[PDB]
Each structure stands twice: as C-alpha cells, then as structure tokens.
Amino acid sequence: KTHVQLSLPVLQVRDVLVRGFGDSVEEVLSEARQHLKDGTCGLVEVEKGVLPQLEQPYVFIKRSDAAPHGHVMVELVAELEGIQYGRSGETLGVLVPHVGEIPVAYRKVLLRK
Question: How many domains does the chain have?
Fold first, then answer.
C-alpha cells in the first residue's frame, strides 16, 4: 500500500534514550522508515528547546494534505545544518527510535510509504 495507518507514541524529549536515527540524511530517512514499519518509532512534539536536545540529521513528519479515519496524512522530511530534503506541510513532530519510553499520548497518522 502507498499509505499505512500508524499510531505513534508521543515521547517527552527528556525521556528519549536514542536521540536520532543516524549520521546522514539518507540514513536517517532509511532508519525512520524501517522503525515506522517495525512499530519502533516515536514522535516528539517540536517546541522551543526541543531540537537542540536531539541529534541531527532530524526526521520530521509533515502534513501532506488537508484526515482519513482520524489519521492525518504525513510524509517524511529530513533536515541537516538548516537544509531540508523534501518539501511538505506543517510539522507534527520529530521522529526518534522508540526503545520502551512511556508515551504521553498517541498520534494517529497515515504515512506516505
């Protein structure tokens, strides 16, 4: 399928143990997509002070359209040293590995895969 319904655990930035997906834009997009397929991806909501506490390159989920079955349609955009790879809508959050941190909420998304 071109899209997959996922329910992503929303993590507090100070709880995150693994603060990024790797070392290059292509690696972090690759790993993000693998962890989304494996159910081992979390979401951190972006506010003042969050991104400097995580590791670049960043992987964002961004709204791809204006929400089937309560799932916002999203796609991935990476960022390294202020350059984004992809073009999309509003940021829903930054993706990180999930390694068993307790979430504060779940974010239902339809991921363009």
Answer: 1
